[PDB]
Design an enzyme around this catalytic site. Structure first.
Site, PDB file in Angstrom:
ATOM      1  N   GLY A  81      10.558   2.928   5.064  1.00 17.43           N
ATOM      2  CA  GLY A  81       9.882   1.640   5.209  1.00 17.43           C
ATOM      3  C   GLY A  81       8.742   1.517   4.229  1.00 17.43           C
ATOM      4  N   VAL A 140       0.821  -1.223   0.000  1.00 17.21           N
ATOM      5  CA  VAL A 140       0.000   0.000   0.000  1.00 17.21           C
ATOM      6  C   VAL A 140       0.860   1.282   0.000  1.00 17.21           C
ATOM      7  CG1 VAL A 140      -1.865  -1.272   1.194  1.00 17.21           C
ATOM      8  CG2 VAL A 140      -0.387   0.246   2.479  1.00 17.21           C
ATOM      9  N   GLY A 141       2.122   1.121   0.328  1.00 20.18           N
ATOM     10  CA  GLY A 141       2.941   2.289   0.574  1.00 20.18           C
ATOM     11  C   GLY A 141       4.396   1.982   0.764  1.00 20.18           C
ATOM     12  N   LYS A 197       3.552  -2.371   8.944  1.00 20.91           N
ATOM     13  CA  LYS A 197       4.627  -1.483   8.541  1.00 20.91           C
ATOM     14  C   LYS A 197       5.957  -2.184   8.836  1.00 20.91           C
ATOM     15  CE  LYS A 197       6.560   3.079   9.136  1.00 20.91           C
ATOM     16  NZ  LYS A 197       6.315   4.453   9.728  1.00 20.91           N
ATOM     17  N   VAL A 246       4.459  -0.164   3.996  1.00 20.01           N
ATOM     18  CA  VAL A 246       3.251  -0.722   4.545  1.00 20.01           C
ATOM     19  C   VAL A 246       2.476  -1.653   3.565  1.00 20.01           C
ATOM     20  CG1 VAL A 246       1.053  -0.113   5.678  1.00 20.01           C
ATOM     21  CG2 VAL A 246       3.047   1.155   6.109  1.00 20.01           C
ATOM     22  N   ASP A 288       0.694   8.751  11.439  1.00 19.85           N
ATOM     23  CA  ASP A 288       1.759   9.272  10.587  1.00 19.85           C
ATOM     24  C   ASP A 288       2.430   8.126   9.826  1.00 19.85           C
ATOM     25  OD1 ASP A 288       3.642  10.721   9.260  1.00 19.85           O
ATOM     26  OD2 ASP A 288       4.570  11.599  11.001  1.00 19.85           O
TER      27      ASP A 288
HETATM   28  C1  LIG Z   1       0.234   9.925  15.189  1.00 19.89           C
HETATM   29  C2  LIG Z   1       1.584   9.821  15.883  1.00 19.89           C
HETATM   30  C3  LIG Z   1       1.395   9.263  17.303  1.00 19.89           C
HETATM   31  C4  LIG Z   1       2.316  11.176  15.925  1.00 19.89           C
HETATM   32  C5  LIG Z   1       2.430   8.887  15.074  1.00 19.89           C
HETATM   33  C6  LIG Z   1       1.961   7.682  14.583  1.00 19.89           C
HETATM   34  C7  LIG Z   1       3.068   7.165  13.941  1.00 19.89           C
HETATM   35  N1  LIG Z   1       3.282   5.988  13.280  1.00 19.89           N
HETATM   36  C8  LIG Z   1       2.325   5.453  12.529  1.00 19.89           C
HETATM   37  O1  LIG Z   1       1.211   6.000  12.546  1.00 19.89           O
HETATM   38  N2  LIG Z   1       2.721   4.381  11.793  1.00 19.89           N
HETATM   39  C9  LIG Z   1       1.939   3.671  10.922  1.00 19.89           C
HETATM   40  C10 LIG Z   1       1.226   4.322   9.908  1.00 19.89           C
HETATM   41  C11 LIG Z   1       0.443   3.588   9.044  1.00 19.89           C
HETATM   42  C12 LIG Z   1       0.349   2.197   9.170  1.00 19.89           C
HETATM   43  C13 LIG Z   1       1.053   1.501  10.163  1.00 19.89           C
HETATM   44 CL1  LIG Z   1       0.977  -0.340  10.333  1.00 19.89          CL
HETATM   45  C14 LIG Z   1       1.821   2.272  11.029  1.00 19.89           C
HETATM   46 CL2  LIG Z   1       2.725   1.399  12.289  1.00 19.89          CL
HETATM   47  N3  LIG Z   1       4.068   8.061  14.096  1.00 19.89           N
HETATM   48  C15 LIG Z   1       5.293   7.994  13.621  1.00 19.89           C
HETATM   49  C16 LIG Z   1       5.581   7.599  12.331  1.00 19.89           C
HETATM   50  C17 LIG Z   1       6.885   7.540  11.838  1.00 19.89           C
HETATM   51  C18 LIG Z   1       7.948   7.920  12.647  1.00 19.89           C
HETATM   52  C19 LIG Z   1       7.689   8.354  13.937  1.00 19.89           C
HETATM   53  C20 LIG Z   1       8.826   8.772  14.814  1.00 19.89           C
HETATM   54  C21 LIG Z   1       9.240  10.192  14.457  1.00 19.89           C
HETATM   55  N4  LIG Z   1       8.335  11.157  14.345  1.00 19.89           N
HETATM   56  O2  LIG Z   1      10.406  10.432  14.324  1.00 19.89           O
HETATM   57  C22 LIG Z   1       6.385   8.372  14.410  1.00 19.89           C
HETATM   58  N5  LIG Z   1       3.710   9.174  14.806  1.00 19.89           N
END
Ligand SMILES: CC(C)(C)c1c/c(=N\C(=O)Nc2cccc(Cl)c2Cl)n(-c2cccc(CC(N)=O)c2)[nH]1
Length: 337
Positions: free
Chosen positions: A32, A26-27, A49, A34, A160
């Site tokens: 990385g 998807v991405g 992810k 997803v 994010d």
């Molecule tokens: C909303 C919030 C809490 C600020 C957040 C969620 C998140 N990661 C994800 O949301 N990851 C994600 C996105 C789409 C699908 C999947 Cl499985 C995941 Cl794990 N975040 C996040 C994403 C990438 C890096 C970082 C660390 C950084 N900022 O350096 C945090 N941040």
């Protein structure tokens, strides 16, 4: 000890537990990629992810650690939460890879494109999740329509993707103080972004589609006007202040004339979010108390975050040490009830 399987998608080997099946790309980006999967231990649809070379640098290993920490911390209906986190590696010395799993929710906000009633509900849930995040001393910093997961029923999660992508340009949604490093920014940089999203949901156009940071700023000041004496002296950066001082003066536009035919409560809220001086920008908690959200507002069900320990943010560690902290965090993960 789950039984893992190797499989290759698009570019890369995914080695994941058997429970996750039917991985669909998807991405992808520098940080990385997803996949959607089915999880056979729940019957539900997931995002998985995979971080790419999580520990390739210092900045990467900390980023990795940070994400794991943030996602573990997030326990809110309107914010992404961690269902699973795993690694193939059965030892710290083996550990090179981090996979994060979450409850796939479907489209993002620009794909889901809308009544004024839909706009209230969506923007309400953004602010609701944002109040929570801000309550943990977290700034999202990249709040745009592609980092909003919305389902069939217009229920929304803040996330994010953070992949490094190359299209929703994050600068379109960036407050000018963080974009041009005017000064020490606050959390209201996220409120600006919500303002741009709200605008967009209402008009269907990106509010400020700037082609770069200079064009970006141009477009911004067309609407909000150029900063006066007062805000100018807050731009503690001299090079940034000198640049601003040099621009052609622009008047603030009356938004009622811009957002023609909009709920006047939506316009007023916009005015409060799209404030150039972040000392004056409405906050998440305050915005939830706006009359625009009367149908939804419930101060008894607008929850705050448990305390989030960011002592680590002040650490200068080695890759191997960030990598070991991350590892610890993976092992200590206990899933959702
Ligand atoms: C909303 C919030 C809490 C600020 C957040 C969620 C998140 N990661 C994800 O949301 N990851 C994600 C996105 C789409 C699908 C999947 Cl499985 C995941 Cl794990 N975040 C996040 C994403 C990438 C890096 C970082 C660390 C950084 N900022 O350096 C945090 N941040």
């Amino acid at each position: 000890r789950p039984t893992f399987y190797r499989q290759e998608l698009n570019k890369t080997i995914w080695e994941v537990p058997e429970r996750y099946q039917n991985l669909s790309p998807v991405g992808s980006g520098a940080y990385g990629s997803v996949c959607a999967a089915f999880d056979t231990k729940t019957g539900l649809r997931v995002a998985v992810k995979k971080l790419s070379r999580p520990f390739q640098s210092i900045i990467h290993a900390k980023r990795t650690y940070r994400e794991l920490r943030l996602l573990k911390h997030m326990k809110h209906e309107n914010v992404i939460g961690l269902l699973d986190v795993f690694t193939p590696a059965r030892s710290l010395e083996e550990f090179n890879d981090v996979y994060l799993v979450t409850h796939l929710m479907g489209a993002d906000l620009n794909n889901i494109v809308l009544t004024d009633d839909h706009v209230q509900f969506l923007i309400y849930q953004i602010l609701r999740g944002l109040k929570y995040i801000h309550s943990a001393d977290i700034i999202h910093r990249d709040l745009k329509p592609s980092n909003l997961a919305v389902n069939e029923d217009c229920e929304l999660k803040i996330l994010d993707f953070g992949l490094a992508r190359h299209y929703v340009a994050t600068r379109w949604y960036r407050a000018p103080e963080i974009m041009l490093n005017w000064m020490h920014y606050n959390q209201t940089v996220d409120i600006w972004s919500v303002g741009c999203i709200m605008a967009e949901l209402l008009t269907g156009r990106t509010l400020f589609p700037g082609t770069d940071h200079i064009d970006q700023l141009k477009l911004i000041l067309r609407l909000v006007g150029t900063p006066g004496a007062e805000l100018l002296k807050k731009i503690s950066s001299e090079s940034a202040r000198n640049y601003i001082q040099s621009l052609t003066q622009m008047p603030k536009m009356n938004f009622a004339n811009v957002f023609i035919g909009a709920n006047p409560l939506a316009v007023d809220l916009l005015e409060k979010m799209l404030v150039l001086d972040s000392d004056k920008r409405i906050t998440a908690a305050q915005a939830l108390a706006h009359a625009y959200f009367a149908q939804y507002h419930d101060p008894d069900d607008e929850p705050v975050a448990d305390p989030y320990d960011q002592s680590f943010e002040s650490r200068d560690l080695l890759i191997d040490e960030w990598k070991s902290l991350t590892y610890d965090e993976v092992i200590s993960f206990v899933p959702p009830p």
